[PDB]
DNA sequence: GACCACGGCGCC
DNA sequence: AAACGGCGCCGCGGTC
Ligand SMILES: Nc1nc2c(ncn2[C@H]2C[C@H](O)[C@@H](COP(=O)(O)OP(=O)(O)OP(=O)(O)O)O2)c(=O)[nH]1
Ligand SMILES: [Mg+2]
Ligand SMILES: [Mg+2]
């Protein structure tokens with residue numbers, strides 16, 4: 001390319017190098033652009049950012065987040081990663097995408113700009129004639145990238161002092177548990193080491209090994225194994241409490257307070273747009289799609305996520321979403337009827353499981369019931385079900401029989417999906433998002449059947465993901481209009497922040513947008529709550 | 540200090 | 552653990 005002075009013309013492809021992967025924490029080390037057989041290298045990149053009307057190129061959203069951080073409204077536009085990810089969602093990194101579609105991801109901004117240009121042309125060519133994938137690019141993924149950049153740049157408020165205090169209390173309880181464990185073992189050891197614990201439980205103590213680990217075949221110390229051993233020895237209950245507390249302390253209570261950004265005073269995640277096989281987003285650096293919610297201590301942690309003063313959180317979560325999606329994709333009349341009658345399948349399973357009235361079903365039970373309902377649907381075995389339910393094998397076996405007897409056209413959808421995946425090599429969502437599953441023809445049964453479970457899950461999980469993305473794209477400009485903010489997506493949930501005076505209106509509008517995003521054979525229902533913290537906002 | 544493969548486990 | 556699926560992060564043990 002011809003070396004041309006900086007500034008590039010309109011529509012040029014950007015390249016940029018960050019000092020580290022996280023755009024909210026990164027120093028912009030270099031910036032360049034490519035168009036019309038020229039390359040333009042920015043003499044000073046922060047200043048040079050001011051010249052661009054959009055970020056067009058590889059990882060466009062990341063540059064846009066750093067721009068937003070610096071007070072500049074630079075929206076992301078075309079990104080070859082999104083084209084590649086729609087072609088094949090195993091296209092997840094610029095290293096891989098470059099190698100596959102015509103270059104090399106280097107560490108030089110000029111080379112990255114030139115690469116972006118050339119990759120876009122090839123990938124755009126691969127998508128010509130792919131009308132449904134192009135519809136996904138233009139109507140969902142490209143506009144969603146802009147939404148995501150705003151969400152990342154906005155961040156979420158965290159009660160840092162509360163978490164610091166919680167740490168000190170949790171440390172004391174951890175000590176009580178670990179001391180009792182060591183007393184019961186007859187000696188101290190590293191309780192965080194599963195290899196050391198294995199020897200203690202199965203060798204030194206008498207306890208029967210329940211199962212084995214996948215890759216190296218050690219005697220497992222998983223929570224499921226330990227639950228089976230609850231009655232066998234008092235040390236087990238202590239280990240399980242220790243595990244809960246140390247998990248929560250090391251993953252959330254301790255790290256999150258140290259991640260507050262000094263310019264915003266907020267916590268800033270990354271919403272990774274080309275990271276999953278099904279078309280879900282992911283969240284990292286810190287992952288805010290797995291904040292605790294289930295146990296009393298987990299709930300305590302979730303309360304640290306709070307609204308700005310003068311604002312409220314609004315949390316919206318699709319009701320029974322993959323079951324509704326399944327009703328649409330399958331066309332089962334009974335399943336469709338269930339949702340037209342306004343019934344809740346999780347609550348029903350929960351009521352049946354724990355033998356209490358529907359009004360007695362608590363959140364723990366509902367989560368237990370979710371495991372059963374999705375478990376059975378996506379191919380859980382009777383043996384595992386026995387344990388989950390804590391009933392005889394023969395009864396757990398019969399539960400699966402009835403499930404599919406009740407909803408007869410699901411199995412037919414499963415089988416059509418699978419043969420189509422064998423013939424075509426891929427499966428697809430309602431909108432035509434594709435996942436290639438080659439091991440559907442594998443001759444090792446365990447490998448083939450694993451592949452099958454991956455393959456027929458994807459149209460359901462992926463259609464839910466497409467719906468939620470679409471709703472995000474539609475909703476974002478309405479929030480801007482009302483002075484509200486989109487903060488988090490958690491797969492079928494959004495967390496917004498709204499001024500107190502407009503919070504009720506924002507909740508109503510966001511609920512309607514999510515519910516009417518793309519009408520199906522059944523209604524989509526959305527549960528909405530408002531509160532000062534994330535826990536209270538889902539109450 | 541980094542990176543890893545693994546087991547394990549938090550959420551959806 | 553087990554014929555549920557999709558993720559990312561932690562600590563260990565190990566390496567470089
Ligand atoms: N395969 C599988 N999928 C799950 C599991 N938990 C959640 N999901 C998927 C299916 C859910 O429909 C979707 C959203 O999770 P939610 O916790 O919001 O559950 P759902 O929307 O079904 O119920 P809700 O009415 O919101 O309580 O993510 C699980 O244990 N296994
Ligand atoms: Mg839901
Ligand atoms: Mg949810």
Ligand SMILES: [Mg+2]
Nearest residue numbers: 544545546547
């Ligand atoms: Mg792993």
